Amino acid sequence: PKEIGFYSRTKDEEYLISDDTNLNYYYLPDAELDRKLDLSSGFQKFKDYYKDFEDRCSLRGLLETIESSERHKGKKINADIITFRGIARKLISCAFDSPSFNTVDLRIVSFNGQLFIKEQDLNVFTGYKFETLATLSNPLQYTPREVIEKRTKRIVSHGDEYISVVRTGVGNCKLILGAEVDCIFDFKENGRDNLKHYAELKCTQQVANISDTHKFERKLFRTWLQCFLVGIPRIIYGFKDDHYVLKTVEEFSTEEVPVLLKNNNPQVGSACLEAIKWYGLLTEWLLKMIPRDEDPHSQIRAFKLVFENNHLRLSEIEESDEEYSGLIDGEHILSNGFKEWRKSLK
Amino acid sequence: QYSSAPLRTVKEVQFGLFSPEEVRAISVAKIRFPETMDETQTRAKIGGLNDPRLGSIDRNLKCQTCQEGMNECPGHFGHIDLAKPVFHVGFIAKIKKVCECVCMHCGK
Amino acid sequence: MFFIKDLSLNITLHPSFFGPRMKQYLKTKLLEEVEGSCTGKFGYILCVLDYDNIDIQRGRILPTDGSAEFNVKYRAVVFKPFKGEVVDGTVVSCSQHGFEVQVGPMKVFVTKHLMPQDLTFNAGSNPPSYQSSEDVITIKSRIRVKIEGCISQVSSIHAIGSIKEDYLGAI
Amino acid sequence: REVALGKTVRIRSAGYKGQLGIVKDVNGDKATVELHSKNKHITIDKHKLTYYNREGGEGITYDELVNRRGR
Amino acid sequence: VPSFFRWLSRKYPKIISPVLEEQPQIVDGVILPLDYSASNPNGELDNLYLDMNGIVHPCSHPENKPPPETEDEMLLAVFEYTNRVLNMARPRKVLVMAVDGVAPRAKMNQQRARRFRSARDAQIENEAREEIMRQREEVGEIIDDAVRNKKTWDSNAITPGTPFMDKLAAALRYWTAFKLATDPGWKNLQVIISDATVPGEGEHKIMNFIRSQRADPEYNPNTTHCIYGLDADLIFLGLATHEPHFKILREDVFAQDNRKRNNLKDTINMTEEEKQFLQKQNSEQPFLWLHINVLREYLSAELWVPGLPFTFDLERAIDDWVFMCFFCGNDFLPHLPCLDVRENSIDILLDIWKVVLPKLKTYMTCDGVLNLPSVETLLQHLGSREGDIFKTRHIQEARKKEVFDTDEFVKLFEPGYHERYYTAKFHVTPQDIEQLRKDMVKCYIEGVAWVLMYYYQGCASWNWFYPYHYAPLATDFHGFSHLEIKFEEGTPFLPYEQLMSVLPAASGHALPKIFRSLMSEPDSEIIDFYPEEFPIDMNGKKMSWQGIALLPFIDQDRLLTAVRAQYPLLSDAERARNIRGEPVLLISNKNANYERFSKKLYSKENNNNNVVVKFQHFKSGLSGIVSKDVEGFELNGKIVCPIQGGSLPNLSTTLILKMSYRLIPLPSRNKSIILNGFIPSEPVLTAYDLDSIMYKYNNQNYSRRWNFGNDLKQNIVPVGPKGITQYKPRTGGYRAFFYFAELS
Amino acid sequence: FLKERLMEASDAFRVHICGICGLMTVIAKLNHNQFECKGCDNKIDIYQIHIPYAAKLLFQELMAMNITPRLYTDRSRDF
Amino acid sequence: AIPKDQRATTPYMTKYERARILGTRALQISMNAPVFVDLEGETDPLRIAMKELAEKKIPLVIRRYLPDGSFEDWSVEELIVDL
Amino acid sequence: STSTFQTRRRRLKKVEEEENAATLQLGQEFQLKQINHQGEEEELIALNLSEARLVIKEALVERRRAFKRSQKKHKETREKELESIDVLLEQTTGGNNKDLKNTMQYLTNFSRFRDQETVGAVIQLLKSTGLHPFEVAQLGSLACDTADEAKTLIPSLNNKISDDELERILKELSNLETLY
Amino acid sequence: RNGPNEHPGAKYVIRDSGDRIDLRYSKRAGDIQLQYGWKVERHIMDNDPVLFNRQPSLHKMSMMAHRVKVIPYSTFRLNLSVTSPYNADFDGDEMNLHVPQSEETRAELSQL
RNA sequence: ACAGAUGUCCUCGAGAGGUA
Ligand SMILES: [Mg+2]
Ligand SMILES: [Mg+2]
Ligand SMILES: [Mg+2]
Ligand SMILES: [Zn+2]
Ligand SMILES: [Zn+2]
């Protein structure tokens, strides 16, 4: 895993480039945990900016940061598949759960050889409130105590997410992901890779019996898969009860969760190997028959992927389809910068 | 209290006399002054009958020989260098008998 | 020079581990105890061979409490500094007192009145070393040391070496 | 710290109502109060027993904590 | 043993821990050099801070055997003491050496009186010795003039700015360079030297250094720290640093109270045996540990209050405690008449705080800032309560009963002492009583704010002083709910200015020719500030040396004029020591950052002495800013040994790298917040100890002799991180569920 | 029961005995983990036993009487 | 020395042996040690020891010392308990 | 911790003999013909420095395969040797065992022989003489050039006066050590 | 929780390390959590075997093990048929009582 | 620079008068 670049997506959807607008820093002493903080607060006061978003899976900032990285560097990278951390997670996880739990809608384009793929309320609000109460925006040691005391009576907003490009791949196949990082656990190095320092925090319910233990195991499997697809070493989970009160917060580092699921029921123990094999087979199938443009200004076609009946039905659509006009010619998922870059070298 | 030495039970008891060399070697101090608490009636005189090296006398002062108080100090032993040899009271009869048995001019 | 002996160690097992795996418990206790021990009588127990061979006997329950004492019979490699032989070592430290020659898991010290008068302490070179004619010893160098120390085995052993007479150098 | 220490008290209610004694040892909530006529010690709650003056006078309840004094 | 040590041992017994001092083996006469890379039985240690004054002072002019030779003997003694301390503690990351230097004007008020009292005691004892020799010579005996001229070491001469300080600093650098070069275990050790030129009292320098090491984002919260000093307030000051991994090392004063103090005459009576026993006995000095991590739990269990509008924070709970302890007693202000014992009043003040906390709606202090109305209410409640305390103290004094003398004539037990106490300091005038009361209130409030700022956020004034000798009586600070405290920064005093503000007596001759000529002349512009007979000794309760002086203060302007007049005609070589200077950092030849330092500074760049390097704690440690050395150190050179008769071999400059170290400036105010990622220590306390500290125990009442007993049975306490997770398992599941299953 | 009443219920003492001497003239430093017998130069053959304080007093008085009650933890029948 | 299995002592358990095994087992169960029977609502260590001895489920070995010095090992399960 | 029963009046022998000197005079416990655990009358081994390295390596790999199969059921030159030794020691023994690294490094950087056939040849050559295993261990551990050097460095070797066969097997040891 | 004042209760709580807790002096009515392996010095209750002896002890029947039954009066009470081996009457005789302090001693007294 | 108090049990050899 190697970091290529990063970008910020704050309000107004301006997709700024190479800015640490938030870079949320984690800080939570055990005294605050014992203080029995309430996660309900002003539920009706939530301000969600996702409704005004022009596209849920918009990759304008990712495209801009890819353009900037290409301008700074020379030859293009060997990675092909590009995903905004949503398609890859669903594609790997759909083989483990029922297809009814996930909605499949994939638009794969092979412009310039590279591949570009674009796709309760109370619980979500409580998780966002916990995330906002577990961080203090600017790093500790450079903020006054007024911010620390105000963090309790703060507001909850959906936006200003730090997104960093991570390059990975297994074997010959290599791909990059537009992973979003919402927490940094240690000192941040400027101009150097910060993947080993990043961390991810989430919320979950408590356990009462073996069924709740299995549910927690499933949640751990999901979060471990989503972190391993990127390379996040630290996983933080916040326990919650029926009263929406944070009870205990524990961290789950990497290189020990696999053994923790191994020393458990055989299903979760073999789930890791099954997911790895499924990811490998999916990558091998993906690199099989997708056309390669090689030189720029070549023929470009789009493909539709639908996962039904435990099978990824892929068909080559014709130019008469409306989706073809809106993607090949409409440039809905592309931009003028990418075509300018493609015409620049050739 | 913890001691790293292995714990065993006494299986045999060997009696015998005390050689002057052995008692001189095992002694931790030499007693010459026939006074006790002679340090201007404040402390214990060095080399007296109450030498501090013998052991912890009172209160909670650790004995300097073993750096411990009284609950684990057996009591270290001194020695007195007699000017002239002196008969043992309990062995007078045996000494007389063995003197009668052996020649008083040769060790035969 | 290393010796293979048939030492024995007594372990007082607690009744809390009086299950089917008490044998393996004694095995791991023996490993974690005997390794790295600087016994005065013997020396260093570097490693125990034939792990799957060492046998235990019937443990006698003490009259005082329920803990049982086991007399294991193991064999292992033992290193003893001994006295009256030559040995090769590698320096690891140097000072005005002398050079800390290291032989295996040992640190034998050489005092001022041990080495001949053909060694003077100086710090001109990068490593602080004793420098004189046709003798060059440094922080990392070859040296042959003859041991004549009294060991002084009190829960740990030591060694004192000499540099007198020829062949006790780098070569 | 504890007010009930060495002060003559009168046992109220229970089987020793009207008895006169002096509290010697107090620990937690239970208070050990000796008996004058009887050569025995009885442990009762400090709140239940009233408090009197050593020389003699009116009796008061456990409100001595507020007063922080005697009598 | 001091009363404070007894009080802390009685209230908090488990904080006393035993030490493990290694004894090198002696075989065939030779001594085996003890190893340094071996694991420390007292737990892993990373940072060690040492107050060099607390070592150089006891070694010089001791109570058993004064150094017969010149300063060389004292230098050897302090060198061996430092070596023993280093071998006992075994630092692994950074070792810090600091000695007292320039101090703010508030410290001169008591330091000057203490130095003058010591000088007067030395003078009177010298006069008594001279009379003894005169009486002895009358008999007929003859004594050589060398013995008669063999006076004391002049302990008053040990002051920053003197050539003795420069000589000691030069020797220390050679000693630490030799230790770094000759010890393979000092490869990762970094040694900084804070000479007397650098301003500070020895402990404030350590506080600034630890706050600067905490002035880095990458600083590890799990690092361990040790500070060695004989001062009693040292154990209390380390608590304010909010570092759980803290422990104080100091000599065992319990044994030293009744240690060996026999005369040298008795050492020759029994010849070899007794002298050998004595030299073996004093060769080992027992020590003890003062762990603060355990003390934090005791403070948490003792400062708890049921019912509070705000949120109970452990970090904020300690702030009021430390502020109150400083208010009760500190080496910056005169002792309060109500708080004289300073031990029994602590519990009274704590229960006053406990009863007043529900009334208040805010904490006592906020990062060193004192809440004015809250502290006003606290002192009002204390004054309302101080009447009972004063009555009890007077009753106890009367029962116990059944050089100016001032407090005896006051007769505080009689009613109407409000003006009687003030009459001992001023005249009998009504309006002057109110004027002096208001002035004392203002001065005391300003001094409390200044000491709080100094001990929490560093020095803020550097020139504030206390223009009074007697603290106000009870029911003080009645109306002061309108004053706003705002101190102004001032420049630190020059070494000569600080030396003359200390004001050594006429016996002291550390000053140069010009200054001693300006002093000893009868017609001196500041002759009124320098008494000779010194009759200002005054008992005021207590006994022996605890009495304070009543000599008039010193005007700063007159001293400044005197120093500016004496400066131009002083020699340039002597004037070259007026530079404030900076701490010097020493690193080993194989340090992790040694290559970077040698490539950046003192390298082929050949910059004009303006390039600086800032490095973080990720590599090696000791985050800070390094600058070019201002001394004569250079590559491929040699350092002359100043010890002379010490048989110390010469060393080259290729083994030790010398540079000037500058602390990183604080970006914002130093708050009291536990850093993220801190790993709590192993749980050692039990609920029984919590209940024991929650219930008021009258020094255990000696019911079962639990105060003293199997003290060594407490054993060592584990230190350092314990467990990857920093949160204790409460409810939750998975790992916590497995822990619950394996426990129950 | 007899052993418990004689030792646990009345007086229990722990002492160190030299493996060569057989006596109790062993200096024990539990904190320093040092057990040296100056008489024989023995530092690796020290055992600890549990005996009543009355037995300790009797043995010390016998040693003062120039009689050595050497104590050993092994049988000499094996020769 | 151990007399192989040509032992010649008594194939029954003496009263002193019964008392010693009962006491040792009672102490072991009183401390945290495994029990090889179904407590079945018993909470006194001595009664648990008797319950274990009822069907000879005590893993203890008796070493009977001959006056000369030899000894033969007798298992608890193979010792007849008639008293 | 002992392996030999008390005999020859161990209780009060006082100073039976001075500690071992250069001229042999072995200690009380390290004497020849040690007591074997199963039986009796077992002679002291003849273990040299190179033999020790092979023995400890064999024990390490045996324990390695041991706990590797256990967990499976439950579920250049000097530079190359150092890495292999480190990766073997990292998990086989476990615990701390700090001293094991130093002695392993000493064995690796001072290995006179690095082949099983070489050590077999050298001890089949050394078994011809009736020398004390201590003497043959030092002879095979430290290389020597001259007969007087061997006598001075390794005392108690005065029984060989001819020095012809001594020169022969010294040359044999030299060429075997150079054949590494 | 009952404490050392009531008859069913304890006087000391011995910890694993070896330190002794006195329930009388400390009190506080605290909910002390007893960890496994600790020792609690509780009062002797009913059916507790004790040793009952009379001097002179001429024969082995002069000292035998009984079962404790707590009675509300300050005098030892025993069966009439037991006095004959003890050779004791009720005209002023006094007899000693010994309490075992371990499990093996209790079992030995009960079974022998 | 610094530094004024506490740890719980004391008899010991005898003599006399009595109880089972
Ligand atoms: Mg998240
Ligand atoms: Mg101070
Ligand atoms: Mg009768
Ligand atoms: Zn002792
Ligand atoms: Zn001995």
From Swiss-Prot, chain B:
Sequence positions that bind Zn(2+) 2: C103, C106
Post-translational modifications reported in the UniProt record: The tandem 7 residues repeats in the C-terminal domain (CTD) can be highly phosphorylated. The phosphorylation activates Pol II. Phosphorylation occurs mainly at residues 'Ser-2' and 'Ser-5' of the heptapeptide repeat. The phosphorylated form of Pol II appears to carry, on average, one phosphate per repeat. The phosphorylation state is believed to result from the balanced action of site-specific CTD kinases and phosphatases, and a 'CTD code' that specifies the position of Pol II within the transcription cycle has been proposed.
Highest taxon of source: Eukaryota
Listed transmembrane segments: none
Residues annotated for Zn(2+) 1 binding in this entry: C63, C66, C73, H76
Subcellular location: Nucleus
Entry comment, domain topic: The C-terminal domain (CTD) serves as a platform for assembly of factors that regulate transcription initiation, elongation, termination and mRNA processing.
Entry's family note: Belongs to the RNA polymerase beta' chain family.
Subunit structure: Component of the RNA polymerase II (Pol II) complex consisting of 12 subunits. Interacts with DEF1; the interaction is direct and serves to bridge RPB1 to the Elongin complex in a DNA-damaged dependent manner. Interacts with the Elongin subunit ELA1. Interacts with the Elongin subunit ELC1. Interacts with ASK10. Interacts with ESS1. Interacts with RTT103. Interacts with SHE2.
Name of this chain's protein: DNA-directed RNA polymerase II subunit RPB1
Swiss-Prot record, chain C:
Protein localization: Nucleus; Cytoplasm; Cytoplasm, P-body
Swiss-Prot/TrEMBL keywords: Cytoplasm, DNA-directed RNA polymerase, Nucleus, Transcription
GO terms, biological process: DNA-templated transcription initiation; nuclear-transcribed mRNA catabolic process; nuclear-transcribed mRNA catabolic process, deadenylation-dependent decay; positive regulation of nuclear-transcribed mRNA poly(A) tail shortening; positive regulation of translational initiation; RNA-templated transcription; transcription by RNA polymerase II; transcription elongation by RNA polymerase II
Transmembrane segments: none
Highest taxon, organism lineage: Eukaryota
Molecular functions per Gene Ontology: single-stranded DNA binding; single-stranded RNA binding; translation initiation factor binding
Primary location group: nucleus
GO cellular component assignments: cytoplasm; nucleus; P-body; RNA polymerase II, core complex; RPB4-RPB7 complex
Keyword Nucleus: yes
PANTHER family: DNA-DIRECTED RNA POLYMERASE II SUBUNIT RPB7 (PTHR12709:SF4), DNA-DIRECTED RNA POLYMERASE II, III (PTHR12709)
Note, other: Present with 6420 molecules/cell in log phase SD medium.
Family stated for the protein in its record: Belongs to the eukaryotic RPB7/RPC8 RNA polymerase subunit family.
Oligomer and partners: Component of the RNA polymerase II (Pol II) complex consisting of 12 subunits. RPB4 and RPB7 form a subcomplex that protrudes from the 10-subunit Pol II core complex. The RPB4-RPB7 subcomplex probably associates with TFG1. Interacts with NRD1 and PAT1.
Name listed for the protein in its UniProt record: DNA-directed RNA polymerase II subunit RPB7
Gene name, Swiss-Prot/TrEMBL: RPB7
From Swiss-Prot, chain D:
Record's subcellular location: Nucleus; Mitochondrion; Chromosome
Domain of life: Eukaryota
Lineage, top ranks: Eukaryota, Fungi, Dikarya, Ascomycota, Saccharomycotina
Note: It is phosphorylated in a PKA-dependent manner in vitro.
Name listed for the protein in its UniProt record: Transcription elongation factor SPT5
Homology family: Belongs to the SPT5 family.
Known partners and oligomeric status: Component of the SPT4-SPT5 complex. Interacts with RNA polymerase II. Interacts with SHE2.
Domain description: The C-terminal repeats are critical for activity.
Domain KOW per the UniProt entry, residue ranges: 3-36
Function: The SPT4-SPT5 complex mediates both activation and inhibition of transcription elongation, and plays a role in pre-mRNA processing. This complex seems to be important for the stability of the RNA polymerase II elongation machinery on the chromatin template but not for the inherent ability of this machinery to translocate down the gene.
Curated annotation (Swiss-Prot), chain H:
Region (Disordered): 1-20
UniProt subcellular location: Nucleus; Cytoplasm; Cytoplasm, P-body
One Pfam family recorded for the sequence: RNA_pol_Rpb4
GO terms under biological process: DNA-templated transcription initiation; mRNA processing; nuclear-transcribed mRNA catabolic process, deadenylation-dependent decay; positive regulation of translational initiation; RNA-templated transcription; transcription by RNA polymerase II; transcription elongation by RNA polymerase II; transcription initiation at RNA polymerase II promoter
GO annotation, cellular component aspect: cytoplasm; nucleus; P-body; RNA polymerase II, core complex; RPB4-RPB7 complex
Segments of skewed composition (Basic residues): 68-75
Family annotation (PANTHER family): DNA-DIRECTED RNA POLYMERASE II (PTHR21297)
Subunit structure: Component of the RNA polymerase II (Pol II) complex consisting of 12 subunits. RPB4 and RPB7 form a dissociable subcomplex associated with the 10-subunit Pol II core complex. In exponentially proliferating cells, only approximately 20 % of the Pol II complexes contain the RPB4-RPB7 subcomplex. In starving cells, that enter stationary phase, RPB4-RPB7 is associated with Pol II in a stoechiometric manner. The RPB4-RPB7 subcomplex probably associates with TFG1. Interacts with LSM2 and PAT1.
Annotated family: Belongs to the eukaryotic RPB4 RNA polymerase subunit family.
Name of the protein described by the UniProt record: DNA-directed RNA polymerase II subunit RPB4
Species of origin: Saccharomyces cerevisiae (strain ATCC 204508 / S288c) (Baker's yeast)
Lineage, top ranks: Eukaryota, Fungi, Dikarya, Ascomycota, Saccharomycotina
